[PDB]
């Protein structure tokens, strides 16, 4: 079988990340690291040999006698955020580990946190609250009222301007709801 780190790992962008994996069958001909997005399928990341392997910012080590295999990511980017799977190939059947999730927090260049109100375009009172442009360290807590809903932080990358921004969306069917009471744990946003 294959045992690897439970995770998740949470690292700043540009940090070096190390992945750890152990296995039972020491004679298996081939070892691999695969990558998987949340709503996607595993994809080969790198083959691993007894001499290790190197591909750009990724390196890998294998010690058959110690039953040890390791992955090392340099200058980690937001695109590296994914589940990494340790794979063994004894005869032809790939054996995957449970995988280790990795989340890479972007470094916000010019944080400008704010909670904006966004009106429905179909001529209605309905509105959502957008918490945006905050630094990656603060943690958006989930709603503590039954009828308000707060999404987890989503990192948006406008590559056209080399720009990156955090965002979270809040909305409620309550008629007492306001954008100034939607969020908990902030910094100093422009709560217009």
């Amino acid at each position: 079988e294959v045992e690897q780190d439970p995770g998740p790992f949470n690292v700043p962008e540009g940090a070096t990340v190390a992945f750890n994996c152990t296995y039972s069958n020491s004679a298996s001909q081939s070892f691999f690291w695969y990558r998987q997005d949340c709503r996607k399928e595993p994809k080969l990341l790198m083959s691993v040999y007894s001499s290790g392997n190197e591909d750009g910012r990724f390196t890998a080590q294998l010690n058959r006698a110690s039953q040890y295999i390791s992955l090392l990511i340099r200058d980690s980017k937001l695109s590296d955020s994914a589940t990494y799977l340790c794979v063994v190939n004894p005869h032809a059947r790939l054996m995957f580990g449970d995988g280790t999730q990795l989340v890479v927090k972007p470094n916000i260049q010019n944080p400008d946190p704010a909670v904006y109100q966004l009106r429905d375009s179909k001529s209605s009172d309905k509105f959502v609250c957008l918490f945006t442009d905050f630094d990656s360290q603060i943690n958006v807590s989930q709603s503590k009222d039954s009828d308000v809903y707060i999404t987890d932080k989503c990192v948006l990358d406008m590559r056209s301007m080399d720009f990156k921004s955090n965002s979270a969306v809040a909305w409620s069917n309550k008629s007492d709801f306001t954008c100034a009471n939607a969020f908990n744990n902030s910094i100093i946003p422009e709560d217009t």
Partner: protein, 238 residues
């Protein structure tokens, strides 16, 4: 690449299902894997030259086949609620195994709770336009079950990927309910000069995966078949 059909499916407990996978051209080995959120990837069977080569210790209700074109089919009879999972196919020349998108199988006791989402886009605030020179549209889909939808942004009739961020995990609307409906949100950011142009059209498209005309429906509401729910917005000068 590797094709897997159908992409999504809904079924009741005790039914039979048939998934199909077409490998990469020139690939003879085809392997099936099951992926559950509680478990990981688990091998089911590998096939080469129309023959079952390697078994994966799965119950015989999980059948498998392969034809001379290297296409492979697998059946799941006597469906049970624990069979709800992603069924991945992988192809190989026979060393590298290329995976397909997978078939999402949802097993339910009731067909009653399948609901399409409601979709709405929300226009950028003027304050964000003034202080950031940027405009964020926000799309919201609500009240759908099972939580299996695909969201996309279409600007002026062309799908866009830059400037988009969708929630990886749909939100449980009522977390306590075991039969809760789900919600999902997404953001599309553009320059304020883009949004201020009134000739620009923005649309959020939510493909919900539900039933088909093969399925039976005997409820007051319309049959919640697989469908496309959209919401739109036009550029505004102010």
């Amino acid at each position: 690449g590797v094709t897997q059909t159908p992409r999504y499916l809904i079924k009741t407990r005790g039914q039979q299902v048939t998934l199909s996978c077409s490998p990469i051209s020139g690939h003879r080995s085809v392997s099936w894997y099951q992926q559950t959120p509680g478990q990981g990837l688990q091998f089911l069977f590998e096939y080469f030259s129309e023959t079952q080569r390697n078994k994966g210790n799965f119950p015989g209700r999980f059948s498998g086949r392969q034809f001379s074109n290297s296409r492979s089919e697998m059946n799941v009879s006597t469906l049970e609620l624990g069979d709800s999972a992603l069924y991945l196919c992988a192809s190989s020349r026979m060393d590298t195994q290329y995976f397909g998108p997978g078939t999402r199988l949802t097993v339910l006791e009731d067909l009653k709770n399948v609901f399409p989402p409601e979709v709405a886009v929300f226009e950028p605030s003027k304050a964000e336009i003034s202080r950031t020179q940027k405009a964020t549209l926000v799309c919201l889909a609500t009240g759908f079950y099972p939580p299996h939808v695909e969201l996309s942004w279409w600007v002026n009739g062309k799908e866009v990927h830059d400037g988009v961020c969708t929630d990886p995990q749909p939100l449980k609307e009522q977390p306590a309910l075991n039969d809760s409906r789900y919600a999902l949100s997404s953001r599309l950011r553009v320059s304020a000069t883009f949004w201020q142009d009134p000739r620009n059209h923005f649309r959020c498209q939510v493909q919900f995966y539900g039933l088909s005309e093969n399925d039976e429906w005997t409820q007051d509401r319309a049959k919640p078949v697989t469908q496309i729910v959209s919401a739109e917005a036009w550029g505004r000068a102010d």
